[PDB]
Amino acid sequence: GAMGSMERASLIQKAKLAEQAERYEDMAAFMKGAVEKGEELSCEERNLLSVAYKNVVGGQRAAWRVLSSIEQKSNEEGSEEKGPEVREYREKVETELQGVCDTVLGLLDSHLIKEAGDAESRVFYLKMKGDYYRYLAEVATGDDKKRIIDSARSAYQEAMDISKKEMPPTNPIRLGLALNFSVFHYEIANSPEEAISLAKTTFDEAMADLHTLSEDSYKDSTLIMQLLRDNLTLWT
Amino acid sequence: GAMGSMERASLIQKAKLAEQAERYEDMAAFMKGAVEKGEELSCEERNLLSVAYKNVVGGQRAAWRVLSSIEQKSNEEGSEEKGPEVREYREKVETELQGVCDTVLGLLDSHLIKEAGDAESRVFYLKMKGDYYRYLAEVATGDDKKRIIDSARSAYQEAMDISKKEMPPTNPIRLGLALNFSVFHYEIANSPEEAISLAKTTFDEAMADLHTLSEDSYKDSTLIMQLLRDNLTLWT
Amino acid sequence: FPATV
Amino acid sequence: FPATV
Ligand SMILES: [Ca+2]
Ligand SMILES: [Ca+2]
Ligand SMILES: [Ca+2]
Ligand SMILES: [Ca+2]
Ligand SMILES: [Ca+2]
Ligand SMILES: [Ca+2]
Ligand SMILES: [Ca+2]
Ligand SMILES: [Ca+2]
Ligand SMILES: [Cl-]
Ligand SMILES: [Cl-]
Ligand SMILES: [Mg+2]
Ligand SMILES: [Mg+2]
Protein backbone atom coordinates (compact mmCIF):
# COMPACT_ATOMS: atom_id res chain seq x y z
CA GLY A 1 0.00 0.00 0.00
CA ALA A 2 1.25 3.46 -0.99
CA MET A 3 0.00 4.69 2.40
CA GLY A 4 1.65 1.86 4.35
CA SER A 5 4.36 4.13 5.75
CA MET A 6 2.03 6.89 6.97
CA GLU A 7 0.62 6.95 10.51
CA ARG A 8 -3.07 6.15 10.88
CA ALA A 9 -3.69 9.47 12.65
CA SER A 10 -1.85 11.36 9.89
CA LEU A 11 -3.96 9.66 7.23
CA ILE A 12 -7.14 10.72 9.05
CA GLN A 13 -5.83 14.28 9.49
CA LYS A 14 -4.97 14.48 5.79
CA ALA A 15 -8.35 13.06 4.78
CA LYS A 16 -9.95 15.98 6.62
CA LEU A 17 -7.63 18.45 4.86
CA ALA A 18 -8.40 16.85 1.49
CA GLU A 19 -12.12 17.25 2.21
CA GLN A 20 -11.61 20.97 2.97
CA ALA A 21 -9.68 21.30 -0.32
CA GLU A 22 -12.34 19.30 -2.22
CA ARG A 23 -9.66 16.78 -3.19
CA TYR A 24 -11.86 13.72 -2.96
CA GLU A 25 -9.55 11.29 -4.79
CA ASP A 26 -6.86 12.11 -2.25
CA MET A 27 -9.39 11.88 0.58
CA ALA A 28 -10.38 8.40 -0.58
CA ALA A 29 -6.76 7.25 -0.90
CA PHE A 30 -6.00 8.48 2.63
CA MET A 31 -9.05 6.72 4.04
CA LYS A 32 -8.20 3.48 2.19
CA GLY A 33 -4.79 3.69 3.85
CA ALA A 34 -6.43 4.20 7.23
CA VAL A 35 -8.70 1.19 6.75
CA GLU A 36 -5.74 -0.94 5.75
CA LYS A 37 -4.12 -0.28 9.13
CA GLY A 38 -6.52 -3.00 10.30
CA GLU A 39 -8.19 -1.24 13.23
CA GLU A 40 -11.92 -0.62 13.38
CA LEU A 41 -13.19 2.83 12.36
CA SER A 42 -14.99 5.29 14.62
CA CYS A 43 -18.27 6.94 13.58
CA GLU A 44 -16.43 10.02 12.34
CA GLU A 45 -13.90 7.91 10.44
CA ARG A 46 -16.61 5.76 8.79
CA ASN A 47 -18.21 8.97 7.54
CA LEU A 48 -14.90 10.25 6.16
CA LEU A 49 -14.56 6.99 4.23
CA SER A 50 -18.09 7.18 2.86
CA VAL A 51 -17.90 10.87 1.93
CA ALA A 52 -14.65 10.38 0.03
CA TYR A 53 -15.77 7.46 -2.09
CA LYS A 54 -19.30 8.84 -2.59
CA ASN A 55 -17.83 11.95 -4.18
CA VAL A 56 -15.35 10.03 -6.34
CA VAL A 57 -17.91 7.53 -7.64
CA GLY A 58 -20.56 10.25 -7.91
CA GLY A 59 -18.36 12.12 -10.39
CA GLN A 60 -17.72 8.91 -12.34
CA ARG A 61 -21.45 8.10 -12.47
CA ALA A 62 -22.28 11.59 -13.73
CA ALA A 63 -19.62 11.26 -16.44
CA TRP A 64 -20.77 7.77 -17.37
CA ARG A 65 -24.34 9.04 -17.81
CA VAL A 66 -23.21 11.85 -20.11
CA LEU A 67 -21.22 9.45 -22.27
CA SER A 68 -23.93 6.76 -22.28
CA SER A 69 -26.47 9.32 -23.49
CA ILE A 70 -24.14 10.36 -26.32
CA GLU A 71 -23.58 6.71 -27.22
CA GLN A 72 -27.32 6.00 -27.23
CA LYS A 73 -27.92 8.95 -29.55
CA SER A 74 -25.19 7.71 -31.90
CA ASN A 75 -27.04 4.39 -32.23
CA GLU A 76 -30.33 6.01 -33.32
CA GLU A 77 -31.66 5.91 -36.89
CA GLY A 78 -30.21 8.72 -39.01
CA SER A 79 -27.18 9.25 -36.76
CA GLU A 80 -23.90 9.52 -38.68
CA GLU A 81 -21.26 6.86 -37.96
CA LYS A 82 -18.50 8.41 -35.85
CA GLY A 83 -16.42 5.27 -35.21
CA PRO A 84 -15.56 3.41 -31.97
CA GLU A 85 -14.47 6.43 -29.91
CA VAL A 86 -17.66 7.11 -27.94
CA ARG A 87 -17.99 3.47 -26.92
CA GLU A 88 -14.28 3.25 -26.10
CA TYR A 89 -14.34 6.32 -23.87
CA ARG A 90 -17.58 5.27 -22.17
CA GLU A 91 -15.91 1.90 -21.54
CA LYS A 92 -12.83 3.64 -20.10
CA VAL A 93 -14.91 5.60 -17.61
CA GLU A 94 -17.00 2.51 -16.84
CA THR A 95 -13.90 0.44 -16.09
CA GLU A 96 -12.55 3.12 -13.76
CA LEU A 97 -15.92 3.31 -11.98
CA GLN A 98 -16.04 -0.47 -11.59
CA GLY A 99 -12.51 -0.32 -10.19
CA VAL A 100 -13.51 2.17 -7.50
CA CYS A 101 -16.54 0.07 -6.59
CA ASP A 102 -14.39 -3.05 -6.38
CA THR A 103 -11.95 -1.16 -4.15
CA VAL A 104 -14.69 -0.12 -1.73
CA LEU A 105 -16.29 -3.57 -1.72
CA GLY A 106 -12.83 -5.01 -1.08
CA LEU A 107 -12.33 -2.84 2.01
CA LEU A 108 -15.74 -3.86 3.31
CA ASP A 109 -14.96 -7.54 2.76
CA SER A 110 -11.39 -7.28 4.09
CA HIS A 111 -12.27 -6.76 6.88
CA LEU A 112 -14.63 -3.98 7.92
CA ILE A 113 -17.92 -5.87 7.91
CA LYS A 114 -16.71 -8.98 9.73
CA GLU A 115 -15.36 -6.92 12.65
CA ALA A 116 -18.44 -4.65 12.90
CA GLY A 117 -20.63 -5.85 15.79
CA ASP A 118 -22.46 -2.72 16.85
CA ALA A 119 -25.62 -1.92 14.92
CA GLU A 120 -24.41 1.55 13.93
CA SER A 121 -21.24 0.24 12.32
CA ARG A 122 -22.61 -2.96 10.82
CA VAL A 123 -25.65 -1.28 9.25
CA PHE A 124 -23.46 1.53 7.92
CA TYR A 125 -21.10 -0.89 6.20
CA LEU A 126 -23.86 -3.12 4.84
CA LYS A 127 -25.54 -0.01 3.41
CA MET A 128 -22.26 0.86 1.69
CA LYS A 129 -22.05 -2.69 0.30
CA GLY A 130 -25.56 -2.33 -1.13
CA ASP A 131 -24.75 1.09 -2.57
CA TYR A 132 -21.56 0.01 -4.37
CA TYR A 133 -23.23 -3.11 -5.77
CA ARG A 134 -26.02 -0.76 -6.91
CA TYR A 135 -23.46 1.38 -8.75
CA LEU A 136 -22.05 -1.75 -10.38
CA ALA A 137 -25.63 -2.68 -11.34
CA GLU A 138 -26.19 0.68 -13.01
CA VAL A 139 -23.54 -0.13 -15.63
CA ALA A 140 -23.98 -3.92 -15.81
CA THR A 141 -25.21 -5.49 -19.05
CA GLY A 142 -23.75 -9.02 -18.88
CA ASP A 143 -24.18 -12.60 -17.60
CA ASP A 144 -23.63 -11.37 -14.02
CA LYS A 145 -26.15 -8.51 -13.98
CA LYS A 146 -28.75 -10.46 -12.03
CA ARG A 147 -26.14 -11.63 -9.52
CA ILE A 148 -24.87 -8.06 -9.05
CA ILE A 149 -28.43 -6.87 -8.44
CA ASP A 150 -29.00 -9.69 -5.97
CA SER A 151 -25.76 -8.84 -4.14
CA ALA A 152 -27.02 -5.27 -3.66
CA ARG A 153 -30.43 -6.51 -2.51
CA SER A 154 -28.91 -8.98 -0.05
CA ALA A 155 -26.64 -6.40 1.59
CA TYR A 156 -29.48 -3.87 1.87
CA GLN A 157 -31.82 -6.50 3.29
CA GLU A 158 -29.37 -7.60 6.00
CA ALA A 159 -28.84 -3.92 6.90
CA MET A 160 -32.61 -3.38 7.01
CA ASP A 161 -33.20 -6.37 9.26
CA ILE A 162 -30.57 -5.21 11.77
CA SER A 163 -31.73 -1.59 11.63
CA LYS A 164 -35.34 -2.51 12.39
CA LYS A 165 -34.31 -4.66 15.35
CA GLU A 166 -31.63 -2.43 16.84
CA MET A 167 -32.19 1.23 15.94
CA PRO A 168 -35.07 3.69 16.45
CA PRO A 169 -37.07 4.68 13.35
CA THR A 170 -35.48 8.16 13.37
CA ASN A 171 -31.89 6.93 13.42
CA PRO A 172 -30.15 8.73 10.49
CA ILE A 173 -28.32 5.59 9.34
CA ARG A 174 -31.59 3.65 9.35
CA LEU A 175 -33.29 6.48 7.44
CA GLY A 176 -30.51 6.79 4.85
CA LEU A 177 -30.43 3.03 4.35
CA ALA A 178 -34.19 3.02 3.69
CA LEU A 179 -33.92 6.00 1.34
CA ASN A 180 -31.27 4.26 -0.73
CA PHE A 181 -32.87 0.79 -0.68
CA SER A 182 -36.09 2.48 -1.88
CA VAL A 183 -34.11 3.98 -4.77
CA PHE A 184 -32.63 0.52 -5.47
CA HIS A 185 -36.19 -0.82 -5.79
CA TYR A 186 -37.27 2.00 -8.11
CA GLU A 187 -34.22 2.35 -10.35
CA ILE A 188 -32.56 -1.10 -10.32
CA ALA A 189 -35.11 -3.77 -9.37
CA ASN A 190 -38.00 -2.45 -11.51
CA SER A 191 -40.12 -2.38 -8.34
CA PRO A 192 -41.59 1.14 -8.08
CA GLU A 193 -44.42 0.00 -5.79
CA GLU A 194 -41.93 -1.47 -3.31
CA ALA A 195 -39.90 1.74 -3.55
CA ILE A 196 -42.92 3.91 -2.77
CA SER A 197 -44.17 1.65 0.05
CA LEU A 198 -40.76 1.59 1.72
CA ALA A 199 -40.30 5.36 1.49
CA LYS A 200 -43.80 6.04 2.86
CA THR A 201 -43.60 3.55 5.75
CA THR A 202 -40.13 4.81 6.67
CA PHE A 203 -41.30 8.43 6.65
CA ASP A 204 -44.41 7.74 8.72
CA GLU A 205 -42.64 5.62 11.34
CA ALA A 206 -39.98 8.31 11.70
CA MET A 207 -42.61 11.06 12.03
CA ALA A 208 -44.14 9.17 14.97
CA ASP A 209 -40.79 8.98 16.81
CA LEU A 210 -39.66 12.60 16.39
CA HIS A 211 -41.20 13.52 19.76
CA THR A 212 -38.43 11.56 21.53
CA LEU A 213 -35.60 13.63 20.06
CA SER A 214 -33.51 16.62 21.01
CA GLU A 215 -33.48 19.67 18.76
CA ASP A 216 -30.21 18.58 17.16
CA SER A 217 -31.34 14.97 16.55
CA TYR A 218 -34.64 16.29 15.19
CA LYS A 219 -32.76 18.43 12.66
CA ASP A 220 -30.67 15.46 11.50
CA SER A 221 -33.61 13.09 11.13
CA THR A 222 -35.94 15.59 9.45
CA LEU A 223 -33.33 16.39 6.79
CA ILE A 224 -33.35 12.77 5.60
CA MET A 225 -37.12 12.53 6.02
CA GLN A 226 -37.41 15.42 3.54
CA LEU A 227 -35.38 13.39 1.01
CA LEU A 228 -37.85 10.53 1.40
CA ARG A 229 -40.67 13.03 0.78
CA ASP A 230 -38.85 14.45 -2.25
CA ASN A 231 -38.54 11.00 -3.81
CA LEU A 232 -42.19 10.25 -3.07
CA THR A 233 -43.12 13.52 -4.80
CA LEU A 234 -41.00 12.56 -7.82
CA TRP A 235 -42.62 9.12 -8.02
CA THR A 236 -46.29 9.93 -7.40
CA GLY B 1 3.43 8.18 -24.52
CA ALA B 2 0.33 6.36 -23.24
CA MET B 3 -1.58 7.94 -26.13
CA GLY B 4 1.02 6.99 -28.75
CA SER B 5 -1.17 4.26 -30.23
CA MET B 6 -4.33 6.38 -30.59
CA GLU B 7 -5.14 8.29 -33.78
CA ARG B 8 -4.79 12.08 -33.63
CA ALA B 9 -8.41 12.52 -34.73
CA SER B 10 -9.61 10.06 -32.08
CA LEU B 11 -7.69 11.94 -29.38
CA ILE B 12 -9.36 15.19 -30.44
CA GLN B 13 -12.80 13.52 -30.55
CA LYS B 14 -12.27 12.08 -27.06
CA ALA B 15 -11.04 15.42 -25.72
CA LYS B 16 -14.38 16.90 -26.78
CA LEU B 17 -16.26 14.04 -25.09
CA ALA B 18 -14.19 14.47 -21.93
CA GLU B 19 -15.09 18.18 -21.92
CA GLN B 20 -18.81 17.32 -22.17
CA ALA B 21 -18.37 14.88 -19.26
CA GLU B 22 -16.35 17.45 -17.25
CA ARG B 23 -13.44 14.99 -17.17
CA TYR B 24 -10.70 17.59 -17.48
CA GLU B 25 -7.77 15.35 -16.47
CA ASP B 26 -8.75 13.00 -19.28
CA MET B 27 -9.26 15.94 -21.63
CA ALA B 28 -5.75 17.19 -20.87
CA ALA B 29 -4.20 13.74 -21.36
CA PHE B 30 -5.95 13.37 -24.73
CA MET B 31 -4.77 16.81 -25.86
CA LYS B 32 -1.20 16.11 -24.70
CA GLY B 33 -1.34 12.99 -26.87
CA ALA B 34 -2.59 15.05 -29.80
CA VAL B 35 0.21 17.59 -29.40
CA GLU B 36 2.77 14.81 -29.27
CA LYS B 37 1.70 13.66 -32.74
CA GLY B 38 3.92 16.54 -33.87
CA GLU B 39 1.52 18.40 -36.17
CA GLU B 40 0.51 21.99 -35.57
CA LEU B 41 -2.82 22.64 -33.83
CA SER B 42 -5.80 24.44 -35.33
CA CYS B 43 -7.57 27.28 -33.50
CA GLU B 44 -10.19 24.89 -32.14
CA GLU B 45 -7.54 22.39 -31.06
CA ARG B 46 -5.42 25.07 -29.31
CA ASN B 47 -8.51 26.03 -27.33
CA LEU B 48 -9.19 22.40 -26.36
CA LEU B 49 -5.63 22.20 -25.05
CA SER B 50 -5.93 25.42 -23.07
CA VAL B 51 -9.37 24.62 -21.63
CA ALA B 52 -8.23 21.20 -20.42
CA TYR B 53 -5.12 22.35 -18.61
CA LYS B 54 -6.74 25.56 -17.31
CA ASN B 55 -9.37 23.47 -15.53
CA VAL B 56 -6.86 20.96 -14.15
CA VAL B 57 -4.44 23.58 -12.83
CA GLY B 58 -7.33 25.79 -11.69
CA GLY B 59 -8.51 23.01 -9.37
CA GLN B 60 -4.97 22.50 -8.09
CA ARG B 61 -4.53 26.24 -7.44
CA ALA B 62 -7.81 26.40 -5.53
CA ALA B 63 -6.75 23.42 -3.40
CA TRP B 64 -3.28 24.86 -2.84
CA ARG B 65 -4.82 28.12 -1.60
CA VAL B 66 -7.06 26.30 0.88
CA LEU B 67 -4.13 24.33 2.27
CA SER B 68 -1.77 27.33 2.33
CA SER B 69 -4.33 29.30 4.34
CA ILE B 70 -4.62 26.44 6.85
CA GLU B 71 -0.83 26.23 7.07
CA GLN B 72 -0.51 29.98 7.61
CA LYS B 73 -3.06 29.84 10.44
CA SER B 74 -1.16 26.96 12.05
CA ASN B 75 1.96 29.15 12.19
CA GLU B 76 0.23 31.99 14.06
CA GLU B 77 0.80 32.76 17.75
CA GLY B 78 -1.43 30.65 20.00
CA SER B 79 -2.04 27.96 17.36
CA GLU B 80 -1.63 24.42 18.71
CA GLU B 81 1.12 22.29 17.14
CA LYS B 82 -0.48 19.71 14.84
CA GLY B 83 2.69 18.18 13.39
CA PRO B 84 4.04 18.07 9.80
CA GLU B 85 0.84 16.93 8.07
CA VAL B 86 -0.50 20.27 6.80
CA ARG B 87 2.86 21.22 5.31
CA GLU B 88 3.30 17.74 3.84
CA TYR B 89 -0.09 17.75 2.16
CA ARG B 90 0.31 21.32 0.89
CA GLU B 91 3.68 20.21 -0.53
CA LYS B 92 2.04 17.19 -2.19
CA VAL B 93 -0.52 19.36 -3.95
CA GLU B 94 2.15 21.92 -4.81
CA THR B 95 4.37 19.26 -6.39
CA GLU B 96 1.48 17.96 -8.49
CA LEU B 97 0.64 21.51 -9.61
CA GLN B 98 4.27 22.17 -10.55
CA GLY B 99 4.23 18.91 -12.49
CA VAL B 100 1.23 19.99 -14.55
CA CYS B 101 2.82 23.37 -15.24
CA ASP B 102 6.06 21.70 -16.30
CA THR B 103 4.07 19.40 -18.60
CA VAL B 104 2.35 22.33 -20.32
CA LEU B 105 5.57 24.34 -20.58
CA GLY B 106 7.22 21.22 -22.02
CA LEU B 107 4.61 20.94 -24.78
CA LEU B 108 5.04 24.61 -25.61
CA ASP B 109 8.82 24.23 -25.78
CA SER B 110 8.70 20.90 -27.65
CA HIS B 111 7.61 22.13 -30.14
CA LEU B 112 4.47 24.24 -30.31
CA ILE B 113 5.99 27.71 -30.02
CA LYS B 114 8.85 27.21 -32.48
CA GLU B 115 6.46 26.07 -35.23
CA ALA B 116 3.88 28.83 -34.60
CA GLY B 117 4.33 31.57 -37.21
CA ASP B 118 0.89 33.13 -37.45
CA ALA B 119 0.13 35.82 -34.90
CA GLU B 120 -2.98 34.04 -33.61
CA SER B 121 -1.09 30.85 -32.79
CA ARG B 122 2.16 32.38 -31.60
CA VAL B 123 0.47 34.90 -29.28
CA PHE B 124 -1.83 32.19 -27.94
CA TYR B 125 1.09 29.92 -27.04
CA LEU B 126 3.22 32.70 -25.58
CA LYS B 127 0.26 33.73 -23.42
CA MET B 128 0.03 30.14 -22.19
CA LYS B 129 3.77 30.18 -21.42
CA GLY B 130 3.31 33.35 -19.36
CA ASP B 131 0.29 31.89 -17.58
CA TYR B 132 1.99 28.64 -16.54
CA TYR B 133 5.11 30.45 -15.37
CA ARG B 134 2.73 32.71 -13.42
CA TYR B 135 1.21 29.64 -11.74
CA LEU B 136 4.71 28.41 -10.88
CA ALA B 137 5.41 31.90 -9.47
CA GLU B 138 2.35 31.75 -7.23
CA VAL B 139 3.87 28.86 -5.26
CA ALA B 140 7.57 29.75 -5.60
CA THR B 141 9.54 30.66 -2.48
CA GLY B 142 13.12 29.70 -3.43
CA ASP B 143 16.36 30.78 -5.16
CA ASP B 144 14.59 30.63 -8.54
CA LYS B 145 11.52 32.74 -7.71
CA LYS B 146 12.84 35.84 -9.46
CA ARG B 147 13.82 33.82 -12.52
CA ILE B 148 10.36 32.19 -12.66
CA ILE B 149 8.73 35.61 -12.45
CA ASP B 150 11.01 36.92 -15.19
CA SER B 151 10.19 33.92 -17.40
CA ALA B 152 6.48 34.77 -17.10
CA ARG B 153 7.15 38.45 -17.82
CA SER B 154 9.30 37.65 -20.86
CA ALA B 155 6.72 35.35 -22.44
CA TYR B 156 3.91 37.85 -21.84
CA GLN B 157 6.00 40.70 -23.22
CA GLU B 158 6.86 38.85 -26.45
CA ALA B 159 3.14 38.01 -26.84
CA MET B 160 2.21 41.64 -26.22
CA ASP B 161 4.69 42.95 -28.76
CA ILE B 162 3.39 40.61 -31.49
CA SER B 163 -0.25 41.26 -30.60
CA LYS B 164 0.16 45.03 -30.85
CA LYS B 165 1.86 44.75 -34.24
CA GLU B 166 -0.31 42.07 -35.81
CA MET B 167 -3.80 42.01 -34.27
CA PRO B 168 -6.59 44.59 -33.89
CA PRO B 169 -7.22 45.95 -30.38
CA THR B 170 -10.48 43.95 -30.14
CA ASN B 171 -8.92 40.59 -31.00
CA PRO B 172 -10.00 38.21 -28.17
CA ILE B 173 -6.54 36.64 -27.85
CA ARG B 174 -4.98 40.10 -27.59
CA LEU B 175 -7.58 41.10 -25.00
CA GLY B 176 -7.16 37.95 -22.91
CA LEU B 177 -3.38 38.28 -23.02
CA ALA B 178 -3.64 41.86 -21.74
CA LEU B 179 -6.12 40.84 -19.03
CA ASN B 180 -3.79 38.15 -17.75
CA PHE B 181 -0.57 40.18 -18.05
CA SER B 182 -2.34 42.93 -16.07
CA VAL B 183 -3.10 40.35 -13.37
CA PHE B 184 0.56 39.24 -13.47
CA HIS B 185 1.56 42.85 -12.76
CA TYR B 186 -0.90 43.19 -9.87
CA GLU B 187 -0.56 39.81 -8.17
CA ILE B 188 2.98 38.63 -9.02
CA ALA B 189 5.18 41.62 -9.92
CA ASN B 190 3.96 43.95 -7.13
CA SER B 191 3.13 46.51 -9.84
CA PRO B 192 -0.51 47.54 -9.29
CA GLU B 193 -0.08 50.81 -11.20
CA GLU B 194 1.19 48.94 -14.28
CA ALA B 195 -1.71 46.50 -13.90
CA ILE B 196 -4.28 49.30 -13.80
CA SER B 197 -2.68 51.25 -16.68
CA LEU B 198 -2.56 48.18 -18.90
CA ALA B 199 -6.17 47.20 -18.18
CA LYS B 200 -7.43 50.75 -18.79
CA THR B 201 -5.47 51.32 -22.03
CA THR B 202 -6.51 47.91 -23.33
CA PHE B 203 -10.17 48.58 -22.55
CA ASP B 204 -10.17 52.04 -24.13
CA GLU B 205 -8.37 50.98 -27.31
CA ALA B 206 -10.79 48.08 -27.71
CA MET B 207 -13.81 50.36 -27.15
CA ALA B 208 -12.62 52.55 -30.04
CA ASP B 209 -12.42 49.58 -32.43
CA LEU B 210 -15.78 47.94 -31.66
CA HIS B 211 -17.41 49.85 -34.54
CA THR B 212 -15.52 47.65 -37.04
CA LEU B 213 -17.00 44.40 -35.78
CA SER B 214 -19.89 42.11 -36.61
CA GLU B 215 -22.49 41.34 -33.95
CA ASP B 216 -20.80 38.03 -33.13
CA SER B 217 -17.28 39.51 -32.90
CA TYR B 218 -18.67 42.36 -30.80
CA LYS B 219 -20.15 39.86 -28.34
CA ASP B 220 -16.82 38.01 -28.02
CA SER B 221 -14.73 41.14 -27.52
CA THR B 222 -17.13 42.85 -25.10
CA LEU B 223 -17.18 39.77 -22.84
CA ILE B 224 -13.43 40.07 -22.24
CA MET B 225 -13.66 43.87 -22.02
CA GLN B 226 -16.08 43.39 -19.12
CA LEU B 227 -13.46 41.27 -17.33
CA LEU B 228 -10.97 44.13 -17.71
CA ARG B 229 -13.60 46.47 -16.24
CA ASP B 230 -14.28 44.04 -13.39
CA ASN B 231 -10.60 43.94 -12.46
CA LEU B 232 -10.36 47.72 -12.66
CA THR B 233 -13.36 47.95 -10.32
CA LEU B 234 -11.68 45.53 -7.89
CA TRP B 235 -8.44 47.53 -7.94
CA THR B 236 -9.72 51.12 -7.79
CA PHE C 1 -32.47 11.42 -10.53
CA PRO C 2 -33.77 10.54 -7.03
CA ALA C 3 -32.08 11.43 -3.76
CA THR C 4 -29.63 9.07 -2.03
CA VAL C 5 -27.19 9.63 0.82
CA PHE D 1 -9.23 36.91 -6.90
CA PRO D 2 -9.10 38.83 -10.22
CA ALA D 3 -10.37 37.56 -13.56
CA THR D 4 -8.12 35.73 -16.02
CA VAL D 5 -8.91 33.71 -19.14
CA1 LIG E 1 3.09 -0.21 7.45
CA1 LIG F 1 1.38 3.68 14.09
CA1 LIG G 1 -15.85 -5.10 16.57
CA1 LIG H 1 -30.26 0.50 19.73
CA1 LIG I 1 2.65 6.33 -32.33
CA1 LIG J 1 -2.47 8.52 -37.90
CA1 LIG K 1 3.95 26.91 -38.69
CA1 LIG L 1 -3.54 40.80 -38.40
CL1 LIG M 1 -10.58 5.87 -24.38
CL1 LIG N 1 0.82 14.04 1.93
MG1 LIG O 1 -17.66 -2.68 -19.71
MG1 LIG P 1 7.67 22.79 -2.70
Side-chain angles (χ1 to χ4, degrees):
Chain A
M3 299 299 176
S5 66
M6 204 186 307
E7 288 279 16
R8 191 184 187 281
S10 300
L11 287 164
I12 298 298
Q13 184 179 354
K14 292 181 184 180
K16 294 174 189 177
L17 294 170
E19 188 182 24
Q20 294 181 81
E22 297 186 297
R23 291 273 292 196
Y24 294 103
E25 186 180 63
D26 288 349
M27 190 188 181
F30 293 139
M31 290 309 304
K32 177 174 189 286
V35 168
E36 291 173 346
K37 299 302 178 184
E39 299 286 359
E40 298 187 32
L41 305 192
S42 70
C43 176
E44 182 175 9
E45 294 164 354
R46 289 190 300 268
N47 282 275
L48 291 169
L49 177 69
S50 62
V51 164
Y53 280 109
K54 177 173 192 305
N55 277 269
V56 170
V57 82
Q60 296 174 315
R61 292 164 67 208
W64 185 94
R65 290 171 187 173
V66 166
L67 298 173
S68 187
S69 173
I70 295 167
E71 188 181 10
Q72 285 182 66
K73 289 188 189 298
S74 80
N75 295 327
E76 287 176 350
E77 170 159 46
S79 303
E80 194 60 51
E81 185 56 60
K82 301 301 209 313
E85 293 84 355
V86 170
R87 174 186 57 75
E88 287 171 351
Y89 185 50
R90 187 270 299 157
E91 286 176 346
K92 180 188 176 166
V93 172
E94 185 174 301
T95 300
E96 290 184 15
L97 182 162
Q98 293 169 322
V100 170
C101 295
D102 289 346
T103 291
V104 174
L105 293 166
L107 295 172
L108 295 171
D109 199 52
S110 298
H111 294 95
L112 290 169
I113 292 172
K114 69 175 57 59
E115 292 297 350
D118 292 355
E120 294 70 26
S121 57
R122 192 170 186 75
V123 172
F124 189 94
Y125 294 136
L126 288 165
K127 176 187 171 294
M128 287 184 60
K129 185 175 181 172
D131 289 335
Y132 286 85
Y133 275 116
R134 170 159 62 83
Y135 305 149
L136 289 176
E138 289 175 340
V139 306
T141 63
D143 280 3
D144 279 346
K145 190 181 170 49
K146 284 173 183 180
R147 271 183 282 277
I148 293 166
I149 293 175
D150 205 62
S151 288
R153 178 204 64 69
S154 183
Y156 285 135
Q157 188 62 60
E158 187 180 346
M160 287 289 319
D161 295 343
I162 299 166
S163 77
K164 288 190 185 186
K165 193 171 299 192
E166 299 296 344
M167 289 165 162
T170 49
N171 178 280
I173 304 167
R174 176 168 170 181
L175 290 174
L177 167 62
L179 180 76
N180 288 20
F181 191 24
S182 168
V183 167
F184 169 82
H185 288 306
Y186 197 93
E187 288 292 323
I188 311 298
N190 192 33
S191 300
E193 289 176 334
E194 188 70 16
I196 292 166
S197 186
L198 178 55
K200 184 159 205 311
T201 293
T202 303
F203 183 95
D204 292 342
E205 277 198 286
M207 177 66 41
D209 188 57
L210 290 173
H211 76 273
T212 67
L213 300 183
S214 72
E215 183 175 356
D216 289 359
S217 294
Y218 179 94
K219 182 179 180 306
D220 292 342
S221 296
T222 58
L223 282 175
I224 306 170
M225 288 173 68
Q226 184 61 52
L227 301 178
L228 290 163
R229 173 61 56 204
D230 292 343
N231 288 351
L232 283 166
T233 298
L234 184 65
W235 295 339
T236 64
Chain B
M3 299 299 176
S5 66
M6 204 186 307
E7 288 279 16
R8 191 184 187 281
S10 300
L11 287 164
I12 298 298
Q13 184 179 354
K14 292 181 184 180
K16 294 174 189 177
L17 294 170
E19 188 182 24
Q20 294 181 81
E22 297 186 297
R23 291 273 292 196
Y24 294 103
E25 186 180 63
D26 288 349
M27 190 188 181
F30 293 139
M31 290 309 304
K32 177 174 189 286
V35 168
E36 291 173 346
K37 299 302 178 184
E39 299 286 359
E40 298 187 32
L41 305 192
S42 70
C43 176
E44 182 175 9
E45 294 164 354
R46 289 190 300 268
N47 282 275
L48 291 169
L49 177 69
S50 62
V51 164
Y53 280 109
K54 177 173 192 305
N55 277 269
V56 170
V57 82
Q60 296 174 315
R61 292 164 67 208
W64 185 94
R65 290 171 187 173
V66 166
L67 298 173
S68 187
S69 173
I70 295 167
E71 188 181 10
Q72 285 182 66
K73 289 188 189 298
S74 80
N75 295 327
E76 287 176 350
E77 170 159 46
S79 303
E80 194 60 51
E81 185 56 60
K82 301 301 209 313
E85 293 84 355
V86 170
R87 174 186 57 75
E88 287 171 351
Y89 185 50
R90 187 270 299 157
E91 286 176 346
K92 180 188 176 166
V93 172
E94 185 174 301
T95 300
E96 290 184 15
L97 182 162
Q98 293 169 322
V100 170
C101 295
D102 289 346
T103 291
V104 174
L105 293 166
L107 295 172
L108 295 171
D109 199 52
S110 298
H111 294 95
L112 290 169
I113 292 172
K114 69 175 57 59
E115 292 297 350
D118 292 355
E120 294 70 26
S121 57
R122 192 170 186 75
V123 172
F124 189 94
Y125 294 136
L126 288 165
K127 176 187 171 294
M128 287 184 60
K129 185 175 181 172
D131 289 335
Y132 286 85
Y133 275 116
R134 170 159 62 83
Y135 305 149
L136 289 176
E138 289 175 340
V139 306
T141 63
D143 280 3
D144 279 346
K145 190 181 170 49
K146 284 173 183 180
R147 271 183 282 277
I148 293 166
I149 293 175
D150 205 62
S151 288
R153 178 204 64 69
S154 183
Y156 285 135
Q157 188 62 60
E158 187 180 346
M160 287 289 319
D161 295 343
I162 299 166
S163 77
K164 288 190 185 186
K165 193 171 299 192
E166 299 296 344
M167 289 165 162
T170 49
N171 178 280
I173 304 167
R174 176 168 170 181
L175 290 174
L177 167 62
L179 180 76
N180 288 20
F181 191 24
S182 168
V183 167
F184 169 82
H185 288 306
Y186 197 93
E187 288 292 323
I188 311 298
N190 192 33
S191 300
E193 289 176 334
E194 188 70 16
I196 292 166
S197 186
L198 178 55
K200 184 159 205 311
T201 293
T202 303
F203 183 95
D204 292 342
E205 277 198 286
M207 177 66 41
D209 188 57
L210 290 173
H211 76 273
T212 67
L213 300 183
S214 72
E215 183 175 356
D216 289 359
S217 294
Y218 179 94
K219 182 179 180 306
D220 292 342
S221 296
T222 58
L223 282 175
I224 306 170
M225 288 173 68
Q226 184 61 52
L227 301 178
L228 290 163
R229 173 61 56 204
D230 292 343
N231 288 351
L232 283 166
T233 298
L234 184 65
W235 295 339
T236 64
Chain C
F1 290 104
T4 56
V5 299
Chain D
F1 290 104
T4 56
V5 299

